[PDB]
From a paper:
The entire outer surface of many bacterial and archaeal cells is covered by a two-dimensional array of proteinaceous molecules, a supramolecular structure known as the surface (S-)layer. The H. volcanii S-layer is essential for cell survival and plays vital roles in cell shape maintenance, mating, and many aspects of the cell cycle (Abdul-Halim et al., 2020; Shalev et al., 2017; Tamir and Eichler, 2017). This S-layer consists of repeating units of a single 827-residue SLP called cell-surface glycoprotein (csg), which is highly enriched in negatively charged amino acid residues, highlighting the adaptation of H. volcanii to hypersaline environments. Using electron cryomicroscopy of two-dimensional sheets, we report the atomic structure of the S-layer from the archaeal model organism [name]. This S-layer consists of a hexagonal array of tightly interacting immunoglobulin-like domains, which are also found in SLPs across several classes of archaea.
Another striking feature observed in the S-layer lattice on membranes was the nearly perfect continuity of the S-layer around the vesicles. Rather than having gaps in the lattice, pentameric defects were observed. We next extracted subtomograms at the positions of these defects and produced an 11.5-Å-resolution STA map. This map showed clear densities for all six csg domains, confirming that the pentameric defects are made of the same csg protein. In our data from cells, the number of pentamers appeared to be increased in areas of the cell with a sudden change in membrane curvature. (E and F) Comparison of the single-particle analysis (SPA) hexamer and pentamer structure with the pentamer model derived from STA demonstrates large changes in relative positions of the domains.
Residue numbers in the entry:
A (entry chain E): 35 to 352
B (entry chain D): 353 to 510
C (entry chain A): 35 to 193
Write the structure that this text describes.
């Protein structure tokens, strides 16, 4: 039917009944329904009053020559009879999430873990047409049939955060494809594919090269802070960057060793740890500088990389 | 040389076996050269050196040492493999060949002239679990893509 | 509650009651309130009459497909019953001032004296959501937790 589109396993329907909603780019069907029983429609109020809506022809767009609003059969009057309201097609939010959550859109992901991805979106036009998904390689070729896993290319409204194929959303197994940057294309089934009704979600595939670390400088003096970046890690998980206490100056104290790593960037906690307990920057309760053996700073990652910093001050000249 | 043959529109798969191809295109297939660069020529016993080389078509590579017999695996450490970048080049930090634990390193401890080679992940435990854990013989090492170079170890004097 | 947001130590609330105000980019909550008792709303007058407002879905922006104005349950009619007016989100003025006054925005300041700075702003959306502050280094990294001193990253209207 119309308004319950998946109830009949149909990707679209253009049999409009009285009082339903119609979108900008539709192409009404002149068969049985409100396309042959009442092909001429006129506006009711607001900017749409007086303006006519020809259902036998495709409906124009960009809110010109067809103002948004309720449409009568009589126009602005005393009749509330076969009826159409004109909305705008919209895609609001859309994300790519792993089998256990975690947005990975616009961020590089490991080829090994890119085997149970999901695509979800929210769209305004659910009564009229479903929205298609089309995966495109960087060369620009439709690889959808190779990577499709289920749900039949149709993603339902809502269903954002659905990590299972039971809910709305299509799963893509992008593990077999090579490394590169890929674009997922969402657009309406038949007609609603123009601006604000379509969205391109990008995705980067690259080898699971071991976690990459780089420094803005290699030759520095004491006191000069150095920013270190962690690269190519799984989003939402906590890495640990360690500091060997042998490189520390011998005349350092307990409080002097807990400030080697700064809270700059995505760093979560800083302190010094041992094989049994840890001494964080919150309090001087755990191991002391002579008691402890490692200096650490647990750091998360948001996107493809995270940035931290170090204090080269009080470090051995080596 | 490998050829590709296209056929006219509307032809069936079974009926296309005999009809000549409308056009064609040919390409050549070889195997990429995976070679080592730095562990070559001379080596002071007990010293540390980096692993430098290239690998056109590889994901995991292993280093083996041979002397009058089997290619004993050298336990480089983490996962016994080195990844390759987009530039078809793989590298490792400074590693002491004799210092590291394993029976492979024991061959290089004694002074003499030996052989060292690298091999791609085509071994994969010569069939089995996804890990390089064997001592491949001459036939097994040569069968896959690999390369070896002569190395000799010299004594260390302060 | 809604309209008095800091009274419950909340950074936001989406439980709209009858007669309140709603902004362009909101995402109404379909829980108890005017999101399950009356999810369908229609315009009243002006350019918004006849146009519908779907509260169960996020509200569009840039004054297209959702004209600004008061919305009835019946439309342009003789009923004044569950009710929403649609405004636009706005930040009017904002400045950085030293501990004893003096705007220092867009101007170089000494590192020694840059230790008691303040950030203030005026925003239209005070009933709905507070406004966040995020300090970014020239390299482009969130250093807010390092430089924060108080007020919990939330700045009130006025002030």
């Amino acid at each position: 039917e119309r308004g319950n589109l998946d109830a009949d396993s149909e990707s679209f329907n253009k049999t409009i009944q009285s009082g339903d909603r119609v979108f900008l780019g539709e192409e009404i069907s002149t068969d049985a329904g409100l396309g042959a029983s009442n092909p001429l429609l006129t506006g009711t109020a607001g900017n749409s009053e007086g303006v006519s809506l020809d259902l036998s022809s495709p409906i124009p767009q960009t809110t010109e020559n067809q103002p948004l609003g309720t449409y009568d059969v009589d126009g602005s009057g005393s009749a509330t009879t076969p009826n159409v309201t004109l909305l705008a097609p919209r895609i609001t939010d859309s994300e790519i999430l792993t089998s256990s959550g975690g947005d990975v859109t616009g961020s590089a992901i490991s080829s090994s873990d890119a085997g149970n991805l999901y695509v979800n979106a929210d769209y305004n036009y659910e009564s009229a047409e479903k929205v298609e998904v089309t995966v495109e390689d960087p060369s620009g070729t439709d690889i959808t049939n190779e990577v499709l896993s289920g749900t039949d290319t149709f993603v339902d409204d809502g269903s954002i955060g659905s990590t299972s194929s039971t809910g709305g959303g299509v799963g893509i197994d992008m593990s077999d494809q090579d490394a590169g940057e890929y674009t997922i294309i969402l657009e309406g089934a038949e007609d609603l594919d123009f601006g604000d009704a379509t969205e391109t979600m990008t995705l980067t595939i690259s080898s699971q090269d071991e976690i990459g670390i780089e420094l803005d400088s290699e030759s520095v003096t004491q006191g000069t802070d150095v920013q270190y970046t962690v690269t190519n890690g799984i989003d939402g998980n906590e890495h640990v960057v360690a500091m060997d206490l042998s490189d520390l100056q011998n005349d350092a104290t307990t409080e002097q060793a807990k400030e080697v790593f700064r809270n700059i960037g995505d760093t979560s906690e800083v302190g010094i740890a041992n094989s049994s307990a840890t001494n964080t920057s919150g309090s001087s309760t755990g191991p002391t500088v002579e008691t402890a053996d490692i200096a650490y700073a647990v750091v998360e990652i948001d996107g493809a990389s995270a940035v931290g910093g170090i204090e080269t001050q009080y470090l051995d000249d080596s | 040389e490998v050829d590709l043959e296209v056929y006219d529109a509307g032809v069936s798969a079974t009926a296309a076996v005999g009809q000549d191809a409308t056009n064609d295109i040919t390409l050549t297939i070889e195997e990429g050269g995976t070679t080592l660069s730095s562990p070559t020529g001379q080596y002071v016993v007990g010293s540390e050196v980096d692993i430098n080389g290239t690998a056109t078509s590889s994901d995991s590579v292993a280093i083996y040492v041979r002397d009058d017999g089997d290619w004993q695996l050298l336990e480089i450490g983490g996962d016994n493999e080195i990844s390759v970048d987009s530039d078809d080049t793989f590298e490792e930090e400074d590693i002491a060949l004799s210092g590291l634990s394993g029976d492979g390193s024991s061959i290089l401890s004694l002074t003499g002239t030996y052989r060292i080679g690298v091999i791609d992940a085509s071994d994969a435990d010569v069939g089995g679990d996804g890990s390089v854990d064997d001592s491949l013989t001459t036939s097994e090492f040569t069968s896959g893509v690999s390369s070896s170079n002569s190395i000799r170890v010299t004594d260390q004097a302060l």
